[PDB]
Amino acid sequence: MITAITIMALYSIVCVVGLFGNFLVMYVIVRYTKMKTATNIYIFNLALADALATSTLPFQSVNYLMGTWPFGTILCKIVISIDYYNMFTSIFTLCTMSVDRYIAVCHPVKALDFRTPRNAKIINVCNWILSSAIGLPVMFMATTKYRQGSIDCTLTFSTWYWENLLKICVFIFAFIMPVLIITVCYGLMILRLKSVRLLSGSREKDRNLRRITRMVLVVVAVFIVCWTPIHIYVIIKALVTIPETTFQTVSWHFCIALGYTNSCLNPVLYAFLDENFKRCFREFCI
């Protein structure tokens, strides 16, 4: 009741803040060509995915007060497909961003040649295709169930096998592989930063490189912190059939809320970790 309305209020606050912040990030990235760097290309996709995953929160939150789904199965389809597209889009974007830094640092000669913004958009597109390859089935099997109590929105499968096959294809192809690629790149960029006195030659350029890479790593770590709980809980709850409990329900709600709040946390990180973003957030906001 009171607790439920506080949960709804928190979800509404997260919805508004995340949508506004991610819209602002997309606009600031699109505003100027000097802000169209390769890192900004992937930041654009990350913010786009966050905005898409946040736009459905009013529907996802109104349900707590009714136990019913009046919005429609089409909207149910879209919301359920968004919930899955978000994980793949964002993690793949971060993996591509962390791989790009390796080309920038350890192979600067070919870095500028292969990191054109057209190539960045191409690796954004490929991320989209690979995510769609496991996202489209979610929408194609997502439909509402006309329960006796109240209509509900849920997935369907033909259902103990594929329901877990999708979970494995997420935990493997969308968490562990991208994390393992990010680590494999960073473990070598970090050594190339120290073993090389100056990377880009120009001291200002080297400082900009070591700072943009730090922001990329910070965003990557923020995403990992925010999303590891939900992935791990999703895997474990199915693995050991954890039964219903007060602590279990609270932890589930907290994990989902943190995963959704990452979307509105990203704007804070961009504001607190980049001179360009910080200046623009006041420039367009005044």
Contact footprint for ligand A1BNM (CB under 6 A): 53, 60, 83-84, 86-87, 167, 170, 230-231, 234, 256, 259-260
Closest contact distance (angstroms) between CB of 13 and ligand A1BNM is 14
Residue 69 beta carbon to ligand A1BNM: minimum distance, rounded to whole angstroms? 12
- 143: which 2 tokens? 């439909």
By C-beta, is 87 or 189 nearer to ligand A1BNM? 87
* 155: alpha, beta or left? (left if phi > 0; alpha if psi -120 to 50): beta
In angstroms, what is the minimal distance from the CB of 230 to ligand A1BNM? 5
Question: For strand 142-145 and strand 152-155, is the pairing parallel, antiparallel, or unpaired?
Answer: antiparallel
Residue with smaller CB distance to ligand A1BNM, 240 or 286: 240
- Closer to ligand A1BNM by CB, 85 or 277: give it: 85
Closest CB to ligand A1BNM among 83 and 100?
Answer: 83
* Contact present, 115 and 99 (Cβ < 8 Å): no
> Is residue 171 within 8 Å of 235, Cβ to Cβ?
yes
Residue 87 vs 219, nearer CB to ligand A1BNM: 87
Cβ partners under 8 Å of residue 65, min gap 6: 4, 5, 8
Give residue 208's Cα distance to chain centre. Answer: 25
Q: Minimal distance in Å, beta carbon 108 to ligand A1BNM? A: 37
C-beta of residue 102 within 8 angstroms of C-beta of residue 117? no
Q: Which residues pair with 155 in a beta bridge?
A: 142
Smaller CB distance to ligand A1BNM: residue 53 or 220? 53
Nearest distance, CB of residue 257 and ligand A1BNM, angstroms? 8
Q: For residues 171 and 165, what is the distance between their CA atoms, to the nearest angstrom?
A: 10
Q: Least CB distance from residue 237 to ligand A1BNM, whole Å?
A: 10
